Design a protein around this ligand. Structure first.
Ligand SMILES: Nc1ncnc2c1ncn2[C@@H]1O[C@H](CSCC[C@H](N)C(=O)O)[C@@H](O)[C@H]1O
Lengths: 265, 265
């Protein structure tokens, strides 16, 4: 009679909360999805071994079109868990799955876990200063989407930081790199000539957040566009003007150049 | 000789990530602070029992003024952990403590935990639609803060939601309720009269996120300003223009008036 939405955290199998693990261990069935994101620092095998339950993986269609035919029926007469990378209900379409549960006469509870939305705090940027967030998407065929670029302009205009998720093909395991995102943005800039993202723009790159050894780097696009930030996933952040303390952190902790202490403050 | 900033999570001691618990268990000395937020579902005892260590609680002054004299010294010789509610670097100034660690020749690592900042996902509001966030601070003497009112206006104009952290004076056991935050906002509307926050403004209240049964309520200020949402902590959210599915969730899950189902696009 209960469905548990349990987050797995940021990077590996230990990023799940003690509450999340203990509850999942007492469930009769355990589902998971890895289409909204992947746990780059672990495997399904390691996650199963830790929970001690076999985990049936679901596709985007399994969830989006048949959550009520696949997961909810079992939740009617058992304790069922639905695992997802990060914090549950962060992924735009997930909240409504709770409405489905309600409609099916199933109770649902949410066990939270670390999300990249809060993990970026490790970049030293004050979290209250973040504005609208967006995802950078790959152009394709006759379609060049550029709204993420307009958002950077609108946020920075107001002194707000912009968090940019990079496109991902979880099935193909093809991640967009911070480098590809920057070059995409330089291309969009050349098209709109808006002066929003150039070689002189200051950006922050966060890779493998959650890991004990994440890669935190800050600098101008002209020097970072070709730097190796390691293995995915990659998160890109275009900061609005900086508070002196944020700059000091980026310089001391993320190796940013002294120049931002006068140029971007 | 290392320093770990370990988040304890949103509500009780089980909201700590497995990574955090296992590392906290092997540390030589364990420090913590409980003034940046409130964990209503646990006590210091349960935390000590859970990690098997004496925890010495620090005050805002011990941290802001003597972190480098109290904590950093031991980090030179032993492995130390600094426990904080939620995520250690979110809506705090704890990030700056890493700079102090570096300048003292001490290595630091951050272990994330579920933060209220991503927990907003449980309100059904798309977290990418959140704009700049702010804190509603208690008036002090003749000084009456009002920036949080302008922020709501700014975000609303852009159709973005506004997350409002509520104030806290842990040394006096004071935790601002959503009700008090609403009262303060109506007063500010009085001074400014920008038509930003009134009896007809739709708001969302999330209380004690992280527990199995948090209070999630949505409605008009005229009907919510006197309603009891349980014990703290509470945050307050002033949504902008809603998406259809955001509205459906608020009504079905957060018990909002059916008529916010009709959006004025
Ligand atoms: N479980 C919870 N439920 C509702 N609000 C919460 C909360 N935990 C924190 N808050 C809100 O945030 C304020 C403290 S701000 C510090 C936040 C913390 N680092 C984190 O990651 O969550 C509180 O006064 C309250 O308004």
């Amino acid at each position: 009679m209960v469905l548990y939405f349990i987050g797995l955290g940021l990077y590996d199998e230990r990023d799940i909360t003690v509450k999340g693990l203990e509850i999942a261990k007492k469930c009769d069935y355990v589902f998971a999805e890895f289409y909204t994101s992947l746990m780059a620092g672990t495997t399904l095998g390691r996650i199963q071994k830790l929970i001690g339950k076999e985990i049936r993986v679901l596709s985007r269609e399994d969830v989006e079109l048949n959550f009520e035919n696949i997961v909810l029926p079992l939740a009617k007469e058992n304790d069922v868990a639905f695992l997802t990378p990060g914090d549950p209900l962060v992924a735009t379409t997930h909240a409504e799955l709770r409405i489905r549960a309600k409609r099916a006469g199933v109770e649902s509870y949410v066990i939270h876990a670390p999300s990249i939305y809060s993990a970026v705090g490790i970049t030293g940027l004050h979290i209250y200063k973040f504005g609208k967030s967006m995802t950078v998407a790959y152009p394709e065929g006759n379609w060049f989407p550029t709204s993420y670029y307009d958002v950077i302009k609108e946020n920075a205009e107001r002194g707000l930081h912009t968090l940019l998720f990079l496109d991902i093909k979880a099935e193909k395991r093809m991640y967009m790199t911070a480098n590809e995102a920057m070059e995409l943005l330089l291309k969009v800039e050349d098209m709109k000539k808006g002066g929003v993202f150039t070689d002189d723009t200051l950006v922050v790159v966060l890779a493998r957040a959650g890991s004990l050894n994440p890669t935190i780097r800050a600098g101008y696009v002209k020097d970072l566009i070709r730097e190796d930030f390691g293995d995915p996933p990659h998160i890109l952040i275009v900061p609005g003007k900086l508070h002196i303390v944020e700059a000091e952190y980026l310089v001391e902790i993320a190796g940013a150049p002294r120049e931002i202490l006068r140029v971007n403050v």
